[PDB]
């Protein structure tokens, strides 16, 4: 149940990744301040769907598609992943 890893896959140029890009620009830094032991791996590619992976203990992974989600509900999805 304990969170081990957060992976954010986005695009450098896509309408669906615009909110994810905005979230990483304005809010990733203090997220890393709040959790400076958790790997939030930011991976960006040309033609990938905006996707969020939460790896918990013993290899379980929860997958959240955040295609065409703007910054504030991307933030609340991240908060729901961090809390539960």
């Amino acid at each position: 149940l304990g969170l081990r890893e957060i992976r954010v896959h986005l695009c450098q140029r896509s309408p669906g990744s615009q909110g994810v890009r905005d979230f990483i620009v304005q809010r990733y830094v203090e997220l890393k301040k709040a959790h400076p032991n958790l790997p939030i791996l930011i991976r960006e590619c040309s033609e990938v769907q905006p996707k969020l992976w939460a790896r918990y203990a013993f290899g379980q992974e929860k997958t959240v598609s955040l295609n065409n989600l703007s910054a504030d509900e991307v933030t609340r999805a991240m908060q729901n992943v961090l809390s539960g």
Partner: protein, 690 residues
């Protein structure tokens, strides 16, 4: 047609730029003019006179390799004058060329033989005695039979321009003019097998490859080199299921036409000290051969015994991303996050979270594009020889301004040595330096920080100091947002893929929480041993060479090599490439991800994939850029990484930045294959004693 001129090849019109040569226009049309001395990456020499072609309404044939097209020229390439000129030039070459074709390593690879058959006459009129030239001993890598030399100065131009040694040349005059070294001098720099590549005749041959195979019988497999983190595209030449040769591949964005000497001649280490069967410790404490079932059953029993921080893994250098994600998934299913690498990167601040924090963001075309390059704590000539070759190419052509912070090493070009202290980073970031005002004069800077420099104790402090310096540079110079200044140069093939997959760099987690069960995925650096490991620790080493990790292991699992498996490796640029299968692993050795998956199945936690394509699917769902082969998609968020770096509050040490590789003797042996290679042993002996 702005700034373009119309020319004709055999009557066919074509637009060309000004300064385009006749040969370049002909190959733009689609015909390859014959050549012996022209190389498109060397300077124009114009001496072999084989590229003589006839221009229409011109009485004298011109050399296409040197003469530029003027305007409206009709280049009659297949005219009678051109054919007669080619026949005469081949006759003059083969007049004094020696009858050495059966005893020649250039059997079917001979430009002279092929151009003879395609353009020269079919018989000789030379009734005189041929000349003969005594041979040289320029090293144990290049065998010289100088009687075959046709004096095209390709080796001399390569050594002058790309190798940057100025050691070869022509001594004498006329027919007695000999290519070589006047004194008994041993020509051994890095990038020295490319003279064997570019010598068209068999005068400069490979001494490990001497009298071994033939080009028609050798099969060609296009793969990737893992000896460094450049990721040079290569051809493995394999005959009858045995690796026979390594050649470069043409890739203009990575390695151009050349590969390093370690890459070219370290292939013979794959025939010695190879792990072929699984082995386990017996009751006497000695390694004995056993079956795959028994070895994997022992490891699976231990893996079922332990969990959590008690299980850990360390990844070496010649490790593919497939086995990396396999071991990561296995330790994640036993709930272990101690997936460490031998190579150290600072985890403070952004760490490996942002991909731009540990990448050569400017890339090698950006090395060609830049104007000033500041190298911090690295020796690129031995850490990444093709990277240094591209720096020297930019230094020759674009007048690149190079400066170095670190120990003064010979980089085969003249640079500005700012000093070896790391306090110069603070000085430049503050803005009270002569090279700081040089940077503020410059427009497109490029700061390359070495992973060897990051290996130090104050690696985080060095990284955050360089990041602050780069941020100050971008503030004070006003560069474009598309231009990337910060770059990290790696010397480890597996490091970038492991950092992308989420491995924590360095064994600091291993030292903090010593595990009772350890995996050594190709780990031969000796970073973690049994002295700082607990006494009743179970070590399993999965690898292809038994060098440092196998003798200290309880179970040895023979994996595959980069020539023996199809594998994913990510270079310093972040570009992912895949090696193809050239040969098969010897004995009972298998593919590494297959070994890990079978071990997981026996342990009872089955990994959700069975085939290599499914492994690539898992790689994509972890980080979807290890499947974008030969793709150079750019990264961002350097502002965020620099902000986290600024909030990191470490301070640098007073130790000078000394790279581990100060000399080519340190360059020649770096990993297990180089240490097991006899050719690198001969090279070390030659550069130390001879």
């Amino acid at each position: 047609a702005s700034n373009l001129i119309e020319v004709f090849v055999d009557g066919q019109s074509v637009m060309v730029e000004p300064g385009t040569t006749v040969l370049q226009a002909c190959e733009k049309v689609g015909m390859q003019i014959p050549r012996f001395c022209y190389h498109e990456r060397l300077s124009v020499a114009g001496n072999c006179r084989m590229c003589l072609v006839e221009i229409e309404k011109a009485p004298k044939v011109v050399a296409a390799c040197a003469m530029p097209v003027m305007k409206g020229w009709n280049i009659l390439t297949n005219s009678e004058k051109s054919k007669k000129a080619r026949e005469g030039v081949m006759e003059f070459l083969l007049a004094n060329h020696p009858l050495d074709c059966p005893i020649c390593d250039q059997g079917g690879e001979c430009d002279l033989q092929d151009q003879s058959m395609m353009f020269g006459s079919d018989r000789s009129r030379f009734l005189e005695g041929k000349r003969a030239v005594e041979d040289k001993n320029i090293g144990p890598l290049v065998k010289t039979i100088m009687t075959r030399c046709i004096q095209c100065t390709r080796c001399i131009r390569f050594a002058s321009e790309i190798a940057g040694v100025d050691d070869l040349g022509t001594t004498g005059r006329g027919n007695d003019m000999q290519v070589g070294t006047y004194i008994e001098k041993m020509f051994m720099s890095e990038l020295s097998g490319n003279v064997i590549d570019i010598c068209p005749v068999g005068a400069l041959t490979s001494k490990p490859y001497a009298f071994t195979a033939r080009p028609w019988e050798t099969r060609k497999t296009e793969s990737i080199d893992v000896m460094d983190a450049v990721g040079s595209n290569i051809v493995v030449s394999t005959r009858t299921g045995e690796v026979m040769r390594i050649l470069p591949r043409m890739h203009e964005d990575i390695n151009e036409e050349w590969i390093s000497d370690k890459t070219r001649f370290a292939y013979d280490g794959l025939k010695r000290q190879r792990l072929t069967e699984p082995m386990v410790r017996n009751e006497k404490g000695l390694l004995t051969y056993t079956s795959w079932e028994d070895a994997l059953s022992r490891v699976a029993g231990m893996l079922q015994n332990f969990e959590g921080n008690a299980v850990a893994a360390i990844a070496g250098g010649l490790v593919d991303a497939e086995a990396l994600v396999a071991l990561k998934d296995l330790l994640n299913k036993v709930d272990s996050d101690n997936l460490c690498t031998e190579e150290i990167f600072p985890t403070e601040g952004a760490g490996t979270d942002l991909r731009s924090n540990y990448l050569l963001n400017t890339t090698i075309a950006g090395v060609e594009e830049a104007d000033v390059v500041l190298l911090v704590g690295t020796n690129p000539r031995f850490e990444a020889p093709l990277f240094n070759a591209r720096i020297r190419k930019s230094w020759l052509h674009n007048d690149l301004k190079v400066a170095l912070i670190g120990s003064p090493v010979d980089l085969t070009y003249r640079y500005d040595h700012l000093g070896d202290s790391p306090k110069i980073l603070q000085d430049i970031a503050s803005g009270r330096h002569s090279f700081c005002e040089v940077l503020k004069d410059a427009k497109k800077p490029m700061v390359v920080l070495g992973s060897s420099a990051l290996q130090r104790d104050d690696g985080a402090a060095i990284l955050v100091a360089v990041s602050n310096m780069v941020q100050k540079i971008r503030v004070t110079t006003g560069v474009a947002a598309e231009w990337k200044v910060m770059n990290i140069l790696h010397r480890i093939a597996s490091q970038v893929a492991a950092l992308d997959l989420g491995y924590k760099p360095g064994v600091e987690a291993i030292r903090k929480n010593p595990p009772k069960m350890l995996f050594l995925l190709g780990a031969d650096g000796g970073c973690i041993t049994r002295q700082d490991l607990p006494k009743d620790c179970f070590i399993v080493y999965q690898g292809h060479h038994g060098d440092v990790g196998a003798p200290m292991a309880d179970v040895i699992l023979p994996g595959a090599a980069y020539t023996e498996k199809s594998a994913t490796y990510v270079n310093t640029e972040g570009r992912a490439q895949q090696t193809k299968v050239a040969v098969t692993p010897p004995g009972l050795a298998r593919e590494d991800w297959k070994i890990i998956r079978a071990l997981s199945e026996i342990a009872g936690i089955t990994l959700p994939y069975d085939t290599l394509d499914q492994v690539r699917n898992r790689l994509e769902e972890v980080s979807p850029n290890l499947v974008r082969y030969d793709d150079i998609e750019e990264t961002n968020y350097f502002q965020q990484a620099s902000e986290l770096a600024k909030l990191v509050n470490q301070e640098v040490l007073a130790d000078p930045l000394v790279p581990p590789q100060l000399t080519i003797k340190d360059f020649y042996m770096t990993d297990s294959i180089s240490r097991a290679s006899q050719t690198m042993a001969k090279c070390v002996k030659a550069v130390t004693e001879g």
